[PDB]
């Protein structure tokens, strides 16, 4: 039981030597230089996130180039994520660049772009032209991470609502608007998004973080926008509104993975319900073996402070205990004063939660929910994890070309590293969002076809030794095909490191 497992926990034992969970860092001014990126990577970054809510194509191109240069110097394969703007709504600019409101201030909000630059305490612009169809008198507009709310008093006309300010708040340029409980019908892929996505394909990004996904159909729109050359790019759908939560099953089935995007989510639904959504969404991803990211304000105070709060540490640990493959940093690394240190904390907290995890519970819980009969590769991958537990294997080794088999092993939550020997660099980069996996590139064009698997297995076992996963005489669980079968692994071996 969890209770019995808990009472046996010790703060005095060694922690796991190899961190299983993965860290996604958002790049910005704190962290864009090749040197800053190197330090992020050394610190524990596996995936660099570009937030296309801001910055030009040239800015992000600098990010892309600097990431690749940093990773090449270190000999790492780092994933690159493009995080779409999507159907964001914002205020315009203000006179002087801030204005201040008191509870009871009457204020007009207007869709008329004439006011975009010159917002004031009594009138300012919101960049959503259908505003007055979307929110009626009596409705509420949420401003600036939902910190300030306006009750709509009346509709002055098709361009303008008169609003009552409900609480005190200071407002600066271009803050976020949310309209929970309104008919908001913006595309999942705007014209801006489409060009962004095309740019991502041209530049070979590994994955898309698709903002505000509401439906399976929207996932398919993102896939269509990525077009012929973007077919192998992962789509990680971000769940950040009511409807995305409602439609979680079909959204998961359509996507390659999920981000619990807790920032918008906690404004779109009551903040206290995010803790339940998170648990639900993460576990649904674990059951089907698709990567899941927990995001937003995880170590927030370390944007300014050299140490996190007690709540922030527990948040990171519990996202790991919940089942999340990855945990994410936004402003902490994009613009914070302690980018390296915040990644380093996050890494240490991950390893602690990982060592606190009751090792076979996830394996059994996930196994028990799978439909029988399995396909053979799933029976192989799950039974290979069971073998690993049985012999206390210090590593597993899998050949995977698309990544599918590495993800299938990771689905069953082994307690040791999964060394994946892959023939694709992109697979190395994409498997960064998958718990436990460490990728090694085998260049088939250069080294030969390796039909009998022996070159790739050697590469994997030498890597296991060199990187101090295991030594001579240690048993390793090795998964791939026999000499005939093509398309999936049908074989497991147990092998002593030579």
């Amino acid at each position: 039981s969890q209770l019995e497992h808990n009472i046996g926990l010790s703060i005095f034992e060694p922690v796991a030597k190899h961190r299983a969970n993965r860290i996604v860092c958002t790049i910005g001014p704190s962290t864009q230089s090749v040197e800053a990126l190197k330090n992020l990577m050394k610190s524990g970054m596996s995936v660099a996130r570009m937030n296309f809510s801001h910055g030009s194509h040239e800015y992000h191109q600098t990010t892309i180039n600097n990431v690749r240069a940093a990773a090449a110097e270190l000999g790492l394969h780092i994933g690159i994520a493009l995080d779409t703007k999507g159907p964001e709504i914002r205020t315009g600019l203000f006179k002087d660049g801030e204005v201040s409101f008191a509870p009871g201030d009457i204020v007009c909000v207007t869709t008329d772009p004439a006011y975009e630059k010159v917002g004031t305490k009594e009138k300012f612009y919101i960049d959503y032209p259908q505003l007055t169809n979307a929110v009626r008198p009596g409705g509420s507009i949420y401003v600036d991470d939902g910190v300030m709310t306006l009750r709509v008093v009346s509709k002055e006309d098709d361009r303008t609502l008169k609003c009552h300010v409900n609480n005190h708040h200071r407002l600066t340029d271009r803050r976020g608007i949310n309209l929970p409980g309104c008919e908001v019908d913006l595309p999942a892929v705007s014209e801006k998004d489409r060009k962004d996505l095309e740019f991502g394909v041209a530049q070979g990004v590994d994955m898309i973080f698709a903002s505000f996904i509401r439906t399976a159909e929207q996932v398919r729109e993102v896939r269509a926008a990525l077009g012929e050359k973007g077919k192998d790019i992962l789509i990680i759908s971000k769940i950040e509104n009511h409807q995305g939560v409602q439609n979680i099953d079909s959204i998961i089935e359509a996507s390659n993975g999920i981000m619990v995007a807790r920032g918008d989510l906690g404004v779109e639904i009551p903040a206290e319900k995010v803790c339940v959504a998170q648990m639900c969404i993460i576990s649904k991803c674990n059951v089907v073996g698709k990567p899941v990211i927990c995001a937003t304000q995880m170590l927030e105070s370390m944007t300014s402070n050299p140490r996190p709060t007690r709540a922030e540490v527990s948040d990171v640990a519990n996202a790991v205990l919940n089942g999340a493959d990855c945990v994410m940093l936004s402003g902490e690394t994009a613009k914070g004063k302690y980018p390296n240190e915040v990644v380093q904390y996050m890494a240490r907290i991950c390893v602690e939660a990982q060592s606190a995890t009751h090792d076979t519970v996830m394996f059994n819980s996930i196994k028990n929910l799978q439909k029988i009969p399995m396909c053979p590769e799933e029976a192989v991958c799950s039974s290979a994890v069971a073998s690993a537990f049985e012999v206390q294997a210090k590593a597993m080794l899998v050949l995977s070309n698309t990544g599918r088999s590495a993800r299938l092993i990771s689905k069953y939550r082994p307690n040791c590293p999964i060394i994946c020997v892959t023939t694709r660099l992109q697979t190395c980069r994409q498997l960064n969002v998958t718990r436990s996996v460490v990728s090694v590139f085998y260049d088939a064009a250069k080294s030969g076809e390796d039909k009998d698997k022996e070159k790739r297995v050697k590469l994997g076992l030498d890597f296991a030794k060199k990187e101090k996963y295991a030594s001579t005489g240690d048993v390793v669980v090795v998964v791939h095909a026999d000499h005939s079968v093509k398309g999936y692994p049908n074989q497991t071996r147990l092998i002593y490191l030579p």
Copy 2:
């Protein structure tokens, strides 16, 4: 399984109507007025915490009086907790009252009191005579809530360590000192703590939150200092260092309850290990049926902001899921700008977490770890909870004078309220730290002795109706003694509300 339970969560269904968990609020200039306290109570405060690290007796007298006045106005019974300053290690003074250190600076620390008032960059005093025994070369000394770290290079004489400064820091007079992982031999109660406890006893406080408890023996010294007249006051031991974690079993045995005092703990042990200690301590308290409080920075950012961060919401939810009876607010209510709103959020989060709890799992886990044969009252109390689940009881009712039986029922974590009819006002106030319990005072001096239980049961059942726990025709599970057994409850009945 937890996994299966997670995937079936219904995020948008109605939540539990009655909050089971309990909220401790620290009182301060934000919250001390009778009007503020009433609002705090309406918002969901069950226990008022007085932090005797600051403020004079006269200050706390006002808190005591105002709490009682506010509670009486609302017809509530509010616990009053005295949280001791506790013993401390501090540096001496410095020349000019400050010195600045840079990484790599070499500084001596001495326990020779001659240096107490003339600390320099070269040498300064720490008022712990056993220093040179407690930390060896290579050990660490923490200064100023762990913000500066010293590595001990060598022992220079029996009173002096040469140290290496690890990071930039400016020291002022008498900063706090921590010796991480180090045995520390301070008395349980300082001379100030004695005057503070004497004050708490004379003013009738309900419980002591005893600071820096390292051993069971110290708990007994606190108990001894409270004396005959304080014998009924709860001691809630605050676990703040590795010794307390290590000795948790015997500390729990000696105490009435535990606080996981995470702020100080995460200074003494690595921050990431606080999550392990927390899970362990809460579960160990659950197993023996003693109240446990989770504390420190749970909703910190609401000190200044009207909404909490995402990490803060998950911290509160998880402390509940961990099994904590109570959660606590410090600066958030003592000095924050949104005291009512922070308690209200805290209430709403507790309720979500409670509604997501897999109802019978805790009951079964707890029951399965109890030694058989049990005492009769514990068989009665656990089986009564079992019965409650079996009939979907909307409430339980227990007669308890000391509070014992009420805590013994709450030990088994029913999913409905536990109405406790008690003959002691102090019992009403003390049961505020115990999950699920709601107390009704029976005035035996006024209404008579009630040998046959009927008046107390009627009072409890009327309360269930009046307070909308249950209605006519609902089954209530009712626990007390038969006509002849004294000293404990030997009887459970299932009763339909008339």
Copy 3:
């Protein structure tokens, strides 16, 4: 797990001192005298079965009187069961009283009663007039516990079938015929059965063993035949054909209990399938808490031998492990040479299987299948058994007037005796088919109404002491109503024997 429980079993530990399972003995020439009955009772008989397939009303009246006289001398309350003939089919008599057949002998079987007395190797009578409608050419007739089978070659006419003898067998007067897989449409209550049943009511039998029950509707026919004065007589339906197995759910729901009547069953369906039917039927009875009897050839060889076979001992033990309340003897006691000794073996084997039983497994398995919410008396009775386990109670004590509450406790399979204080002698006698129960008669007409339960509880606790179930200072779990509630028990107490 069963496996782990098994490997911990010991032949060297003391056995349970109080036998929980009950023994049904069939009365006949070996056992009909008052003195033989006394010895049966001393030996372990709880229920005397009268087999109305044979003997006149006067013969069974002698059984009834002798049972009551024997039980009165011993101060026991022994149940009396009437086991109906029902739709039995038999051969007639033969010339000389036996005939012998060889494989390939052609033989005519006739419904013509002219041949009833004078059967021969070539022609004999069967007492089922619709024979030639029921079995066609190609069908098989099973004779003498299915030991000999005849293939029907042709229908000579409406009264006569020509048959091929399939195997060697000797035939004596009035052997049984079975026709599995034929349309046999005899009543469940023949004219003979009706008079038998009426006789049973006139003579106050406690229960009916209703032969060949196929449907719920047939159970209702037996109930109707028992009429106004027979309403409180138990109907135990005997399952002994295919259709009875098929309809097990509705048959259980209509009956008071079930006998797995393995003799006819193992001829009506393939013998090897009886082991699966038995497991299924017994467990279905356990789940709804209705008494179930395992019958037929359990200690068969002890009809002639002073000791049983290894198979017979394991059969008795495993019927107990399967969950059966009772085990039954037929010819072993009706006509065997070792009636007392065979009952004594059966008793010892019961106690051994009882001590081998993993004590709380049945409790949990049965509990986990009950619909929630329960009615209050079921939550009381189940939670009272859980209390008993928790304190290692040596006895439980329940007040029951109809027996319902004693059966409800027994449903949850406590490991100690259930002392039932009852106001009805018939309840004492009927509860003999219920595992664990020991009944004590409280004569309310003589001793008073006992509204506060105190006389009956005293009677029960004195009985517990006198019969060496428990001593002064032992905790006993006592179930009945509080001072108000009528119709069911709503209360449980734990009480130390004074």
Copy 4:
């Protein structure tokens, strides 16, 4: 749960097509001819048992020759078992060669060989020199398979006990003696056993059923007597008294397998305790993966009758449910009138019991008791069974030369056949005592060395098809080594049948 599994049983659905359990038949005048043996084999005999308690070497030579001739005709590999007479305690002779005792008769028993040939009612010899040490006053001596009981009243001198006769009995010369609950210090092998073992080794028997095994040391003496040339012959220890039950762990460790020899056991310990010993011993054998045989009177009445009793059917079914690999027939096939029909019934019962088994429960129970870390071959074998369940495999295929790997797979109780391709005819014959296994001989002298496994795997897969275990497109789970590992299997593959 078992209960829930029982209630869902479908009595009339199709049973398993392939019998997993194995049947040992004792050969005798009913069954010794080549024609009888072929029929026995067709009826389902897998092992022929020669009981060396009776018959000359020449008699058993005929059995050996005839078994081999019958097996060769049918293309079968039939195990041959030699069941030793074993050491014994017997009385001496009597004057006139018989004496009769009545209950209450007082008789001396002496170990003074002077009295060996002149036993009377007053005094007679027992040939066990340690008698007066082994049983004290109040202890029991059993005579003539436990049919007469003596209570020891007193020790008269160091060679003589005065005894009280408990029951009527007529003694003839040299009856068997048992000392129940008594340590007995006889050699493992008698002088006759030596000549018998020497004969078994010279004639190439596959296994010894070693009688009256009390200690591990005795197993080693049997092993020593078999010598270098008998080193590959299985020793199946027969557990026949309390010492054997007590020392079961170390006896199992020393043996290749166990027989629960219930006839002799139920003479030495109370008959009702045989069911406890049986459950314990079978489960202990299951846990270490060694073959266990249940023996004695399983279908006794079919010695004379063409159908079994109800108890006999449940005995066979329950031995299977208990976990026994094999069940055994003695007099039923040695000298009974229906040898073919008894084996056929036994087969049909085994199949019902197998079809009612809750498929994965044994697997999980067995796996959960294994020490971690396992050896690699045991992880491979258990995980291969896991895989089989996961894909609903219709067969497994294993390469095993010693039989080890085959037994190791059968340890985990798959629900399909285990096809074992072996290079040894003796391995085919020996694997007859192991549940599920079906052996195919690969002739390496004839077809070559098959380093890369392909010929043996093809042979096994062809067998699966030919023998209708599986078809084209069915997944088979295949266990052997990779190209380089020697001595054990380190590899599992899932293969579709071509």
